[PDB]
From a paper:
Using a forward genetic approach based on transcriptome sequencing, we identified the [name] GSK3 ([name]), a serine/threonine kinase, as the primary enzymatic target of [name]. [name] was identified as a fitness-conferring gene for tachyzoites, as its genetic disruption results in a fitness score of −4.1223. [name] adopts the characteristic kinase fold, divided into two sub-domains classified as the N- and C-Lobe. Overall, [name] has high sequence (54% identity) and structural conservation (r.m.s.d. of 1.67 Å) to the human ortholog, with most of the structural variation located within loops in the N-lobe (N-terminal region).
The kinase-dead Y2H screen identified [name] as its own primary interaction hub, suggesting a mechanism of homo-dimerization or multimerization. In solution, however, the recombinant [name] expressed in insect cells predominantly exists as a monomer, indicating that homo-oligomerization process does not occur spontaneously, but is instead dependent on external factors such as substrate binding, co-factors, interacting partners, or post-translational modifications. In this regard, during crystallization trials of [name] with [name], an intriguing observation was made: alongside the standard crystal forms, a monoclinic crystal lattice emerged after several weeks, diffracting at lower resolution (3.0 Å) and containing four [name] subunits within the asymmetric unit. These four subunits can be reduced to two homodimers, interacting through non-crystallographic symmetry. In each dimer, [name] forms a face-to-face interaction, relying partly on the seed region identified in the yeast 2-hybrid screening, which spans most of the N-lobe. Additionally, the dimer is crosslinked by a disulfide bridge formed between the cysteine 213 of adjacent monomers. This peculiar cysteine, located on the activation loop just two residues downstream of the phosphotyrosine 211, requires significant structural rearrangements to enable bond formation with the neighboring subunit when compared to the monomeric orthorhombic crystal structure of [name]. Despite these structural rearrangements, the activation loop remains in a DFG “in” conformation due to the interaction with [name]. While these findings may not directly translate to [name], given the distinct functional role of the two kinases, they highlight a broader role for this cysteine in regulating dimerization and activation through redox signaling. Together, the Y2H results and the monoclinic crystal structure suggest that the activation pathway of [name] in [name] relies on a homodimerization process, likely controlled by the conserved cysteine 213, a feature preserved across species. Converging evidence from yeast two-hybrid assays and crystallographic analyses revealed covalent dimerization of [name], mediated by a conserved cysteine residue within the activation loop.
Residue numbers in the entry:
A (entry chain B): 27 to 64, 66 to 186, 193 to 365
B (entry chain A): 27 to 91, 96 to 188, 192 to 365
C (entry chain D): 27 to 62, 66 to 183, 193 to 365
D (entry chain F): 27 to 61, 66 to 97, 102 to 185, 192 to 365
Amino acid sequence: TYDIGRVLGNGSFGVVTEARCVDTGEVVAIKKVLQDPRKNRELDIMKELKHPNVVKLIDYFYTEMGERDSNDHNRFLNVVMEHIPETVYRVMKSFLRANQQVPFILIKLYTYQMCRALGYLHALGICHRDIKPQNLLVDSRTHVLKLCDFGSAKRLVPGICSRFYRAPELMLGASEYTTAIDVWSIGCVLGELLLGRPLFAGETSVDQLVKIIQILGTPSRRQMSTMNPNYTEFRFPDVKPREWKSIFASHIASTETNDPSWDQALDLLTKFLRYEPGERLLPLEALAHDFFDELRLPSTRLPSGGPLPELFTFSQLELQNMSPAAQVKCIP
Amino acid sequence: TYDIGRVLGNGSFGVVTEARCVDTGEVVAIKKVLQDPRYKNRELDIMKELKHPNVVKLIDYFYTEDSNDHNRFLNVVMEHIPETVYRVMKSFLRANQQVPFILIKLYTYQMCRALGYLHALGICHRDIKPQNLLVDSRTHVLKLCDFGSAKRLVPGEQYICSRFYRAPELMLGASEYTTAIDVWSIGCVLGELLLGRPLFAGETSVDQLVKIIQILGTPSRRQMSTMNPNYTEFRFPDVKPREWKSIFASHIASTETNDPSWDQALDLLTKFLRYEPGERLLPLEALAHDFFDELRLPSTRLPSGGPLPELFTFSQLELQNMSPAAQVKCIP
Amino acid sequence: TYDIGRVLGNGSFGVVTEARCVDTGEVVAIKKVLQDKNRELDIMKELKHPNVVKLIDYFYTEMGERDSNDHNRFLNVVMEHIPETVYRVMKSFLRANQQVPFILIKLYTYQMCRALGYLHALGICHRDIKPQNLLVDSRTHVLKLCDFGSAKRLICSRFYRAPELMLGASEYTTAIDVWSIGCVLGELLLGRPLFAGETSVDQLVKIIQILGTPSRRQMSTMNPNYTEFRFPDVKPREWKSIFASHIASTETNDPSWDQALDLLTKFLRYEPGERLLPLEALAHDFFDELRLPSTRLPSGGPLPELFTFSQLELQNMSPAAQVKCIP
Amino acid sequence: TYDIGRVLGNGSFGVVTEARCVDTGEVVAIKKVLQKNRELDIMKELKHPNVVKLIDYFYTEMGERDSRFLNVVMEHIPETVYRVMKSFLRANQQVPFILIKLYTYQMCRALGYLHALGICHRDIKPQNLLVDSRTHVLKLCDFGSAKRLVPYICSRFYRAPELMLGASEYTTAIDVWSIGCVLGELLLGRPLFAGETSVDQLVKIIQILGTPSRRQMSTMNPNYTEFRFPDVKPREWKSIFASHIASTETNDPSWDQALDLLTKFLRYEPGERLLPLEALAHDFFDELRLPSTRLPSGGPLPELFTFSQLELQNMSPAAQVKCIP
Ligand SMILES: O=C1NC(=O)C(c2cnc3ccccn23)=C1c1cn2c3c(cc(F)cc13)CN(C(=O)N1CCCCC1)CC2
Ligand SMILES: O=C1NC(=O)C(c2cnc3ccccn23)=C1c1cn2c3c(cc(F)cc13)CN(C(=O)N1CCCCC1)CC2
Ligand SMILES: O=C1NC(=O)C(c2cnc3ccccn23)=C1c1cn2c3c(cc(F)cc13)CN(C(=O)N1CCCCC1)CC2
Ligand SMILES: O=C1NC(=O)C(c2cnc3ccccn23)=C1c1cn2c3c(cc(F)cc13)CN(C(=O)N1CCCCC1)CC2
């Protein structure tokens, strides 16, 4: 049913390629992975998701190979998905090359839809576990953002690489963690969208723990125990917490032009990037932040002038995972 | 001119699959990786250079069959060896049996010699682990492979997700290192061969440094900085150095007639696993160690009874990169 | 003693698995069969030959009680491990749309004959020779017999079974293994089974369509209960007809095609008594290439063991065969 | 959940072993196969008085290395028709007619059920027909060869003639032919067409059914038309059992009804072989429908008549009034 043509980089190690569905002429994305045919976690998770900001699962099928053999005729699972041409990663580097900041309306739209998508996932009990700009699909014309790449997602049963966006509890080898690790990533994406470069760029985990400490300050004994208990008494150098207003001072200087956006973005950044995972602002709660107040005004449009994408038709599971204060605030 | 059938696994990015050469009837391994024909492939150029009894032979290579494409598929054809040190180890583990000292000697020797040659060309493998060490049970030949991470370390430049066998300088944001990182791996493999489990098994960059310190002791201020200068004044908790006979006490206990095997292996383990990369015993130099004296006796055989594999017909390049003291000891 | 791992497949009446010998690190095959004395193990203890699997060890494993139930007892036969079969090598070339090179057809057929000649010299009949039983190492191109669950001093296969067996014969000779040798030479040259019928009737017809009608007397040397039994009358075809297309595609100014087919005709004969004996076959011109000193594997390597005949092998070779076979 | 113990033998593939369910103490049979299965998928569909119940299934791993066992758990019954047969054979005695009727009936009803789901068993033989000596219940088992036949195993004596001619395509009638061979052996004390090979067997079939016509031959395998086969005359079933009919006599139509039922089963043309659910209404089973009939033990007869809706749907109207007592 599909013409496979041209490789779109690499997903969860498996290969992702462009494809045309011959019945409709439409282009789709096909991630082919090597499964053992006697159960694939990513595809079972994909079958559950339905949300305005998650890639649609379209079809799936196994490659034939034909060559039988009393060893392993391998077999390849083909997951067919909605094709969206860009990522938040690309839009950023496009603005970077232009030495220009992403407009605050796009930063608001992207962070919102990322938060809403990750809240749904967490409401189903699913943790994406590898949120980074390279996974946040974007449509330049409608500025829809969709989640994708669920090769690392998992239903965290009580009892991954890409290092710039991992939660600090992960870099300390926490043997147990919560869905909050995605919230730390949300903070890192929002952070990079505002800064023009990663907030905590470091080659290894040691290198990053330092850079996080050089900003959040030295973690307390109690904070350290909420991340990894085995390190409750592991002492770090005593660094005093630096504050966002300072790090972005130059950006606030050059850009800022009659906007409280910078105050709201940095406040929202603070509520995401917290050592104690339980103290991190939950994603569906975050939708109510004043940073998104612009998106609920009726006269707000895309910079193009076109209409805003889907933002407000919350499902009941979305509403159920919102505090009463949040439920009143989000109604546009 | 190959019948491609059955996937062996995932190498550096690409997939490796078994294949039959239709001209000779022989079985080979084909690693298919996603190249860009407009650029150069590092792994293939490196392999094109290697000729050594303990490196996989490069047999052939070819590209497999629009604008906006660019992404083509490089097919590298190599010698097929059906096992790894990884598989042999987990084999003995299940039997609650220690790998015999004759094999621990054979494998570590051939690994050192393969890595000594590699260094003599200026190449660094950068990801030595049991899974890369091909083994043939019948001859107990060991060969290096998986050169997707190899590189001719050029002073002045700058990310691997292999966890247990990386050198401490790598787990700090080093950005400059030497071929000594391969020697640290040699130590971890020899360590695991003797212990039945990884010497420093911890899931993250941070957890492992901790596990290494609980054994090697806290690094001195100068030992740090020969690893990563950016962390010279970084103090760790004060751990006392453990004794290898302590870690191996139970293994040393069970195996009666300790002989110098345990003493020579632990002396050789000590000379590999050193914080300062510059103080680590060089791989060809290691060949002359007393641990391998059994390999040089004329009456020594494999446990099967068969003859020992290639061990001593050193090339001229090997000799030039051996201290004169080592050469008289190594040539039997 | 042994670490048991991968299941390689199914032998005669049991499962065969990979295993590591803990003393040596070597990989071996263990055939575990239900000992509910074995014949196969007695047969295995006798065999020593370059082209038979080595018997390495054996031990019993029991599950349950005894006088209570019937518990279980299992014979575990430990053998030399070879990683491929002729069956696998064949299907590999088939997928490639390629003929097995004549040097490998020579090597495999030669070594198969020698093992079966030795086996027969002991008076043993293998009784189930097929590509799945002919172990091969691509690296050396050594061929070894295995799977002796049917061997016997005088089956569920059908494609490589002799015509006498498929006629229900009660008595047979060791020449049933020579028919199987030819059906393997045939598949190596045709790229597909010479006689491939699902059943034990469909198969005789496909044989008849090539060998012609067995004479009144020929049918009597196969199964006497069928002498005066008439079959449809087909005229015998010629192997050069059946292989005409292959002989064209593979061309060459070599006598291999003529020599290979001359050997096929001498193997595949209705009369068991007229079939070329396995050790006599070694002297056939087909294997003259193997006796040249300059010959190598296609790889470039040395040829496997081919000529160091034991004294028993020599006793079962005609004097003409002895001068032709010693290089 | 299970203690795996004594090995009972080999089914279509894999080994079957005795086992105890630790929860109930009950004994069950576990078929362990090396694996979406077909046999397990088919087993999951069947629920009928004369098919083994599938109780459970579970997989064991054993290994964890780069480059599985299905365990099918079933109702345990300690005998087969095969084992009951050798019992009377060794006893120099014929299987009682009430038992022949019971076994053939339950077998027909089980295969009739199986066909109504579109499944073909393809390897019915005495060794597959479980029996309980106490109740004389018969249940089908060993579905490793079953398949639904959307248009290669070594079963010998009970294969249909179209199968022994390797017919690339066939119908569920092959199970009907086996029913006939099982009934036949129950009456004769030995296989009807026992031969070392297929050749020996067609020869034995030809010596009884006579030489097949071209069109009969074309309903089996279109190939081999007008090809081979001497002129052999059809023999008579009453001749074959003449010695048995003497010794027994009985003054009963049992021998006539059995041989009539044998004739309607063992026919070259597959479409002309008596369908199984039809077979239940045959006069042979009239005794099983009498209220005063009991087992030879004195006990009650097993389940025989409480037909599901599908069983009724595949019975001719004449058959339904004949079968309901
Ligand atoms: O349309 C889609 N539906 C999906 O599910 C899906 C998908 C599936 N797995 C992953 C993993 C990461 C990112 C996206 N995906 C795509 C899909 C859409 N592009 C992709 C690209 C590579 C790729 F591999 C998959 C996709 C290239 N590209 C991109 O911007 N990149 C790739 C990595 C570096 C920069 C960020 C532009 C569009
Ligand atoms: O025969 C060969 N010639 C080569 O060049 C080569 C090769 C190329 N890249 C790599 C990376 C790692 C190891 C080997 N290779 C192989 C090659 C040989 N086996 C391989 C296996 C997987 C694979 F993907 C490649 C190969 C499985 N296996 C094995 O023990 N494993 C795989 C990883 C976990 C356990 C260790 C058995 C032999
Ligand atoms: O190493 C060995 N030493 C022995 O004695 C021996 C052995 C014992 N019984 C039999 C029966 C048939 C073939 C070989 N054997 C083996 C042995 C070696 N492989 C085996 C395979 C299955 C198996 F079941 C046994 C073995 C798989 N395979 C293979 O190519 N196949 C299996 C059947 C279909 C295709 C042909 C690759 C290697
Ligand atoms: O209790 C059960 N529930 C099932 O499903 C089932 C079963 C599963 N597969 C097959 C295949 C053939 C026959 C029965 N089965 C049994 C089961 C019950 N016996 C079995 C015997 C062997 C065996 F392997 C399985 C079973 C021995 N025996 C028997 O009379 N034999 C065995 C073959 C030669 C003579 C006939 C008496 C009881």
